[PDB]
Motif scaffolding. Structure first.
Motif, PDB file in Angstrom:
ATOM      1  N   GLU C 170       0.811  -1.210   0.000  1.00 31.05           N
ATOM      2  CA  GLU C 170       0.000   0.000   0.000  1.00 31.05           C
ATOM      3  C   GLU C 170       0.848   1.265   0.000  1.00 31.05           C
ATOM      4  O   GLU C 170       0.421   2.290  -0.537  1.00 31.05           O
ATOM      5  CB  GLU C 170      -0.922   0.004   1.218  1.00 31.05           C
ATOM      6  CG  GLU C 170      -2.142   0.880   1.065  1.00 31.05           C
ATOM      7  CD  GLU C 170      -3.108   0.348   0.028  1.00 31.05           C
ATOM      8  OE1 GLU C 170      -3.058  -0.865  -0.263  1.00 31.05           O
ATOM      9  OE2 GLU C 170      -3.911   1.142  -0.501  1.00 31.05           O
ATOM     10  N   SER C 175      -2.920   1.685  -5.689  1.00 32.19           N
ATOM     11  CA  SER C 175      -3.978   2.334  -6.452  1.00 32.19           C
ATOM     12  C   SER C 175      -3.430   3.017  -7.695  1.00 32.19           C
ATOM     13  O   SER C 175      -4.028   2.929  -8.772  1.00 32.19           O
ATOM     14  CB  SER C 175      -4.694   3.351  -5.570  1.00 32.19           C
ATOM     15  OG  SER C 175      -5.142   2.754  -4.370  1.00 32.19           O
TER      16      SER C 175
ATOM     17  N   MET D   5     -14.326   1.406 -13.596  1.00 28.56           N
ATOM     18  CA  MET D   5     -12.953   1.878 -13.470  1.00 28.56           C
ATOM     19  C   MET D   5     -12.295   1.985 -14.838  1.00 28.56           C
ATOM     20  O   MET D   5     -11.668   2.999 -15.166  1.00 28.56           O
ATOM     21  CB  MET D   5     -12.158   0.942 -12.562  1.00 28.56           C
ATOM     22  CG  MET D   5     -12.824   0.658 -11.231  1.00 28.56           C
ATOM     23  SD  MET D   5     -11.660   0.143  -9.956  1.00 28.56           S
ATOM     24  CE  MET D   5     -10.912  -1.282 -10.728  1.00 28.56           C
ATOM     25  N   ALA D   6     -12.450   0.947 -15.663  1.00 33.03           N
ATOM     26  CA  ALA D   6     -11.871   0.972 -17.000  1.00 33.03           C
ATOM     27  C   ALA D   6     -12.487   2.081 -17.837  1.00 33.03           C
ATOM     28  O   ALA D   6     -11.785   2.764 -18.589  1.00 33.03           O
ATOM     29  CB  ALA D   6     -12.064  -0.382 -17.678  1.00 33.03           C
ATOM     30  N   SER D   9     -11.172   5.480 -16.677  1.00 34.23           N
ATOM     31  CA  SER D   9      -9.770   5.614 -17.048  1.00 34.23           C
ATOM     32  C   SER D   9      -9.613   5.859 -18.544  1.00 34.23           C
ATOM     33  O   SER D   9      -8.769   6.656 -18.962  1.00 34.23           O
ATOM     34  CB  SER D   9      -9.004   4.367 -16.623  1.00 34.23           C
ATOM     35  OG  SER D   9      -9.062   4.204 -15.219  1.00 34.23           O
ATOM     36  N   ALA D  13      -7.937   9.060 -20.353  1.00 34.77           N
ATOM     37  CA  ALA D  13      -6.896   8.963 -21.370  1.00 34.77           C
ATOM     38  C   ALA D  13      -7.256   9.799 -22.591  1.00 34.77           C
ATOM     39  O   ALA D  13      -6.403  10.502 -23.152  1.00 34.77           O
ATOM     40  CB  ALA D  13      -6.683   7.504 -21.766  1.00 34.77           C
ATOM     41  N   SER D  35     -10.166   5.003  -5.686  1.00 38.01           N
ATOM     42  CA  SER D  35      -8.764   5.365  -5.538  1.00 38.01           C
ATOM     43  C   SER D  35      -7.911   4.771  -6.646  1.00 38.01           C
ATOM     44  O   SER D  35      -6.865   5.331  -6.987  1.00 38.01           O
ATOM     45  CB  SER D  35      -8.247   4.907  -4.178  1.00 38.01           C
ATOM     46  OG  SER D  35      -6.860   5.154  -4.058  1.00 38.01           O
ATOM     47  N   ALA D  36      -8.341   3.655  -7.230  1.00 32.62           N
ATOM     48  CA  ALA D  36      -7.556   2.948  -8.232  1.00 32.62           C
ATOM     49  C   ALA D  36      -8.055   3.169  -9.652  1.00 32.62           C
ATOM     50  O   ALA D  36      -7.538   2.536 -10.575  1.00 32.62           O
ATOM     51  CB  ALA D  36      -7.544   1.450  -7.925  1.00 32.62           C
ATOM     52  N   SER D  37      -9.043   4.039  -9.858  1.00 31.04           N
ATOM     53  CA  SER D  37      -9.614   4.239 -11.183  1.00 31.04           C
ATOM     54  C   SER D  37      -9.315   5.626 -11.733  1.00 31.04           C
ATOM     55  O   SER D  37      -8.661   5.748 -12.771  1.00 31.04           O
ATOM     56  CB  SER D  37     -11.127   4.004 -11.140  1.00 31.04           C
ATOM     57  OG  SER D  37     -11.739   4.852 -10.188  1.00 31.04           O
ATOM     58  N   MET D  40      -6.594   8.552  -8.241  1.00 35.96           N
ATOM     59  CA  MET D  40      -5.137   8.562  -8.286  1.00 35.96           C
ATOM     60  C   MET D  40      -4.612   8.653  -9.714  1.00 35.96           C
ATOM     61  O   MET D  40      -3.495   8.206  -9.996  1.00 35.96           O
ATOM     62  CB  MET D  40      -4.580   7.313  -7.604  1.00 35.96           C
ATOM     63  CG  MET D  40      -4.671   7.329  -6.089  1.00 35.96           C
ATOM     64  SD  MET D  40      -3.554   8.507  -5.310  1.00 35.96           S
ATOM     65  CE  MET D  40      -1.959   7.872  -5.820  1.00 35.96           C
ATOM     66  N   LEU D  41      -5.394   9.233 -10.621  1.00 36.25           N
ATOM     67  CA  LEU D  41      -5.046   9.281 -12.031  1.00 36.25           C
ATOM     68  C   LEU D  41      -5.015  10.696 -12.589  1.00 36.25           C
ATOM     69  O   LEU D  41      -4.817  10.864 -13.797  1.00 36.25           O
ATOM     70  CB  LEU D  41      -6.033   8.427 -12.836  1.00 36.25           C
ATOM     71  CG  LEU D  41      -5.617   7.969 -14.230  1.00 36.25           C
ATOM     72  CD1 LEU D  41      -4.426   7.040 -14.152  1.00 36.25           C
ATOM     73  CD2 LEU D  41      -6.779   7.276 -14.899  1.00 36.25           C
ATOM     74  N   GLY D  42      -5.211  11.712 -11.757  1.00 33.96           N
ATOM     75  CA  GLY D  42      -5.194  13.071 -12.241  1.00 33.96           C
ATOM     76  C   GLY D  42      -3.789  13.602 -12.414  1.00 33.96           C
ATOM     77  O   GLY D  42      -2.828  13.088 -11.847  1.00 33.96           O
ATOM     78  N   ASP D  43      -3.670  14.655 -13.223  1.00 29.60           N
ATOM     79  CA  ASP D  43      -2.366  15.277 -13.416  1.00 29.60           C
ATOM     80  C   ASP D  43      -1.835  15.833 -12.104  1.00 29.60           C
ATOM     81  O   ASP D  43      -0.647  15.692 -11.795  1.00 29.60           O
ATOM     82  CB  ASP D  43      -2.460  16.375 -14.473  1.00 29.60           C
ATOM     83  CG  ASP D  43      -2.810  15.832 -15.840  1.00 29.60           C
ATOM     84  OD1 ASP D  43      -2.385  14.703 -16.155  1.00 29.60           O
ATOM     85  OD2 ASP D  43      -3.510  16.528 -16.601  1.00 29.60           O
ATOM     86  N   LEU D  44      -2.701  16.464 -11.318  1.00 26.26           N
ATOM     87  CA  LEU D  44      -2.387  16.880  -9.959  1.00 26.26           C
ATOM     88  C   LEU D  44      -3.248  16.067  -9.004  1.00 26.26           C
ATOM     89  O   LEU D  44      -4.475  16.051  -9.134  1.00 26.26           O
ATOM     90  CB  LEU D  44      -2.643  18.375  -9.769  1.00 26.26           C
ATOM     91  CG  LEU D  44      -1.517  19.346 -10.122  1.00 26.26           C
ATOM     92  CD1 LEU D  44      -0.411  19.263  -9.100  1.00 26.26           C
ATOM     93  CD2 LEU D  44      -0.977  19.074 -11.510  1.00 26.26           C
ATOM     94  N   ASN D  45      -2.611  15.391  -8.057  1.00 27.05           N
ATOM     95  CA  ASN D  45      -3.312  14.644  -7.016  1.00 27.05           C
ATOM     96  C   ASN D  45      -3.242  15.480  -5.747  1.00 27.05           C
ATOM     97  O   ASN D  45      -2.233  15.469  -5.039  1.00 27.05           O
ATOM     98  CB  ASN D  45      -2.696  13.266  -6.817  1.00 27.05           C
ATOM     99  CG  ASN D  45      -3.227  12.243  -7.795  1.00 27.05           C
ATOM    100  OD1 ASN D  45      -4.298  12.414  -8.367  1.00 27.05           O
ATOM    101  ND2 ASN D  45      -2.478  11.169  -7.987  1.00 27.05           N
ATOM    102  N   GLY D  54      -6.429   5.164   0.092  1.00 30.59           N
ATOM    103  CA  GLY D  54      -5.799   3.871  -0.083  1.00 30.59           C
ATOM    104  C   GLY D  54      -6.604   3.011  -1.027  1.00 30.59           C
ATOM    105  O   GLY D  54      -7.547   3.474  -1.668  1.00 30.59           O
ATOM    106  N   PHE D  55      -6.205   1.744  -1.119  1.00 32.19           N
ATOM    107  CA  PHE D  55      -6.911   0.767  -1.935  1.00 32.19           C
ATOM    108  C   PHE D  55      -7.669  -0.259  -1.113  1.00 32.19           C
ATOM    109  O   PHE D  55      -8.708  -0.744  -1.562  1.00 32.19           O
ATOM    110  CB  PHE D  55      -5.937   0.025  -2.857  1.00 32.19           C
ATOM    111  CG  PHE D  55      -6.607  -0.960  -3.768  1.00 32.19           C
ATOM    112  CD1 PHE D  55      -7.473  -0.527  -4.752  1.00 32.19           C
ATOM    113  CD2 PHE D  55      -6.372  -2.315  -3.641  1.00 32.19           C
ATOM    114  CE1 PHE D  55      -8.093  -1.424  -5.592  1.00 32.19           C
ATOM    115  CE2 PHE D  55      -6.991  -3.218  -4.480  1.00 32.19           C
ATOM    116  CZ  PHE D  55      -7.853  -2.771  -5.456  1.00 32.19           C
TER     117      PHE D  55
END
Ligand SMILES: CC(=O)SCCNC(=O)CCNC(=O)[C@H](O)C(C)(C)COP(=O)(O)OP(=O)(O)OC[C@H]1O[C@@H](n2cnc3c(N)ncnc32)[C@H](O)[C@@H]1OP(=O)(O)O
Ligand SMILES: [Zn+2]
Lengths: 263, 316, 316, 57
Positions: C170, C175, D5-6, D9, D13, D35-37, D40-45, D54-55
């Motif tokens: 983790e 994630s 999530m896919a 994402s 993209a 959190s996993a889709s 946590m995928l933005g240019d700024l987190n 967390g996950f």
């Protein structure tokens, strides 16, 4: 005609060792192999064509630490018979055209100087004009200190050539022999699509002594060896030298969609 | 804390402070004390001018390591506005040795990546004395990719002894991080302006220093290995560092004539530490000049020029 | 080690093995023993056929966790040739939970990525029981990018309980690794064929399961969370797992009618454990068919179709 | 729910290859598939102080 393996202290017959590609038949220790002989073993017979043979050391900085840098260059050229560390030789691998490069660790420790980068770029250009894989056998102690930044900037140049090759979509397999440290491990030796490495090869960025000086402790057992790196992910796979030729041929055939080589 | 050879300047500054205190003590002799202060200021200026007339390579190297000198944060503060710091490589941790962020250069938004040695001993040990772990070069690559995505120029400051030669740093692919940074930085479609303020080299400095325009301050060094290391390997001693520094040619004017750097930024008298504001202004002017003549080129032409410049390094 | 409800099948197989040993021992009573073996062989076939006629969701879920079942390596061995295994994400370490490599599928070179639970307890603890750390998903992404570079199709096997919920796993951005895998896998310019052999879910299975064609074996489950967890959170108990499995709809035929998977690969009678060779042959035929009808589409059209397939998930 | 999530994402993209920024703000709590889709995928987190991210719980 009776050599000895230092790792196990045997009396290996010289021809037996030579026909096994400088690998001890007892402990399987990979010893020093000259660049020209390595390329001859790798590439097919009668198809070798050296590239960048017109490039020679041309010291301009007039370096002198304890021996004249020109004297060092002449001594290395006489001892090894090669103009500089890197030797490029175009050839064919199981009927598949390929361009290969091989370091010569006996030339000032296989350090990377201007001629090394120039020859590497020549190999990359040859591979680009005639689309074919590139194979490199890195054996270097780092960047040539007697050329100062003129050696450091060779990292960026070789990396840019590799970037162009990647854009074109060609494979580039980097075989990490013993030792591969300093500015060669950090520029193009670990920059390949597959970072194959020979067994028990000392690979890293900074030498063990400086690490000990900074940490002043005991390094983990088997530090910076190939078997230690592959568990850390920095090495894609470990391949023994006698099996290197067929393994590379099969890998490059699979990447390039060519028919499998005939064993 | 001035260097060994700048002791007279420190004494003069202490004397100036004492005279200021004496002037504050009394009122009926202020004019003469002020006149003496001005005379001693002129004396200090002339002494600094004469001392710096001939400085050796070792002198320049010592200047580049002065323990009072503007670092990346100082240059950002004195030449950039609205600086938002981005921390984290998204994988292992954020390396304090490299400080990155996005800020504005006279309104224009830029991306800033550079090493931060730290002022005192606490920050020096918190930032690993400016030696970055691979998670610092990965953060630098992430920020550079972000900047290239939003058509943003990149500004890099190169002030570090080199890559951290630790066990943990070596286990996490220091070489791979540096190699990936070098490979990806030659394809960026935005202008990159790199300066070598302070000390840089060992290849951990070139990891953020493959740019269209390479600048260097007058009293900054940039070598493949620290003079101490070159002396240890070749001269077989550590006290012969100055000879190694002289032989290698780690000084800015020496590198300029080799077609290795584009320009040298003159520093204020007494080094960039005396008047950091003037140094920051000169650096900002140089950065603006470098960006002005880089924006004219197209992306494809900019990349072609960058590639051709790299292939011209060395005599071969 | 067969499951609880397959004890009669185990007894018949044990009796056959005992009779074979006895037959090899003697020679004068071979005819009667052979006749009994043939009779018992017919009994086993009919018994397996009738038991499997109606299997509930919990029965299928137990089958998907059978401690005797072909894993990714077994399928690679029985359906692919010239398999070179690539290990390492280049950053932290190589996760043994995910095995990747490049091999040939009837001459055509393919990239293989899938989870490996391990056969015995030693391999099970070496591979974290098929639960991959983020350095496994980063390796998977690296291999997928490599395959997309050399115009190479990608084949993925999804057999894992889920992502490892450890403290170390983790800290290193589980994630972020999963999210980057999901984002990058929708832009690959090569066909991706994903099968769900065994047990998959929790989102650590979708990290390598965003493909053009999604397949699933007859007795394989694919859920957002393990039935045990769903029961614990909602039913407030762990023993009510079968109700959760029935309600979620984790079985292949249930998902097929929801337009979530493309096809189901029939398994040998008694599950894929009885005849792994037949299962491998059926999977290979299905993979060849999927690649055959995927190569006709152009790269741009392939990506557009993949995107539209993703946008069609869900009722909204 | 898992297949969302896919989808998210892939949409991110698409907007990334255009060059449009996407800032992701993480508030207490941001766990599981979110959190996993795309969280946590933005240019700024960007995360609010003392936010549980967390996950796995
Ligand atoms: C900063 C740089 O990039 S160069 C710094 C030097 N290199 C490093 O710090 C990395 C590794 N350090 C080393 O000392 C070695 O490379 C090690 C650890 C692999 C040890 O390998 P060894 O078997 O000890 O080889 P060794 O260092 O003796 O190399 C053989 C010769 O090459 C020379 N050499 C090796 N690298 C270099 C270099 N970069 N510049 C100049 N000479 C070099 C050595 O001086 C030595 O010469 P000598 O035998 O005539 O004295
Ligand atoms: Zn031996």
């Amino acid at each position: 005609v009776w050599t000895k393996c230092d790792s196990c202290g045997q009396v290996l017959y010289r021809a037996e060792l030579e026909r096994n590609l400088e690998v001890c038949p007892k402990c399987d220790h990979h010893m020093r192999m000259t660049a020209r002989n390595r390329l001859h073993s790798l590439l097919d017979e009668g198809s070798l064509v050296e590239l960048g043979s017109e490039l020679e050391p041309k010291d301009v900085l007039k370096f002198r630490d304890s021996k004249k840098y020109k004297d060092r260059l002449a001594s290395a050229q006489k001892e090894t018979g090669e103009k500089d560390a890197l030797v490029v030789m175009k050839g064919t691998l199981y009927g598949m055209p390929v361009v290969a490069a091989a370091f010569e660790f006996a030339f000032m420790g296989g350090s990377m100087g201007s001629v090394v980068g120039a020859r590497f770029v020549r190999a990359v250009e040859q591979a680009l004009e005639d689309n074919c894989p590139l194979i490199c056998f890195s054996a270097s102690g780092g960047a040539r200190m007697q050329e100062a930044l003129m050696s450091l900037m060779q990292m960026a140049k070789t990396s840019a050539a590799l970037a162009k090759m990647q854009e074109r979509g060609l494979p580039y397999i980097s075989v990490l022999t013993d030792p591969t440290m300093g500015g060669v491990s950090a520029s193009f030796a670990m920059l390949g699509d597959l970072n194959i490495a020979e067994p028990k090869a000392l690979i890293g960025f900074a030498g063990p002594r400086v690490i000990e000086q900074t940490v002043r402790e005991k390094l983990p057992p088997g530090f910076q060896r190939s078997e230690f790196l592959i568990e850390k992910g920095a090495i894609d796979m470990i391949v023994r030298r006698p099996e290197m030729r067929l393994k590379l041929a099969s890998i490059l055939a699979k990447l390039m969609n060519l028919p499998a080589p005939n064993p | 804390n001035f260097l060994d050879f700048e002791q007279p300047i420190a004494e003069l500054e202490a004397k100036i402070d004492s005279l200021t205190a004496v002037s504050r003590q009394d009122e009926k002799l202020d004019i003469n004390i002020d006149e003496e202060v001005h005379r001693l200021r002129e004396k200090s200026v002339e002494l600094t001018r004469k001392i710096f007339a001939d400085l050796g390579a070792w002198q320049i190297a010592q200047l580049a390591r002065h323990p009072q000198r503007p670092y990346t944060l100082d240059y950002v503060r004195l030449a950039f506005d609205e600086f938002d710091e981005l921390a984290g490589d998204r994988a292992y941790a954020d390396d304090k040795a490299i400080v990155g962020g996005i800020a504005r250069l006279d309104g224009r938004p830029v991306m800033i990546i550079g090493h931060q040695k730290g002022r005192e001993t606490k920050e020096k040990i918190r930032r690993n004395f400016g030696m970055p772990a691979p998670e610092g070069y990965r953060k630098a690559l992430r920020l550079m990719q972000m900047a290239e995505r939003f058509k943003m120029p990149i500004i890099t400051f190169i002030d570090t002894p080199g890559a951290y030669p630790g066990v943990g740093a070596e286990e996490r692919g220091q070489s791979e991080a540096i190699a990936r940074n070098l490979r990806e930085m030659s394809r960026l479609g935005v202008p990159v302006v790199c300066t070598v303020i302070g000390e840089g080299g060992s290849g951990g400095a070139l990891a953020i220093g493959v740019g269209d325009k390479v600048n260097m301050l007058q009293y900054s060094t940039y070598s493949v290995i620290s003079p101490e290391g070159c002396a240890s390997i070749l001269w077989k001693s550590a006290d012969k560092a100055p000879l190694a520094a002289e032989a290698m040619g780690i000084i800015a004017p020496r590198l300029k004539e080799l077609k290795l750097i584009d320009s040298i930024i003159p520093e204020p008298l007494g080094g960039a530490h005396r008047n950091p504001e003037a140094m920051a202004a000169s650096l900002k002017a140089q950065l603006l000049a470098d960006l002005a003549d880089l924006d004219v080129l197209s992306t494809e032409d900019l990349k072609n020029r960058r590639y051709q410049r790299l292939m011209s390094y060395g005599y071969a």
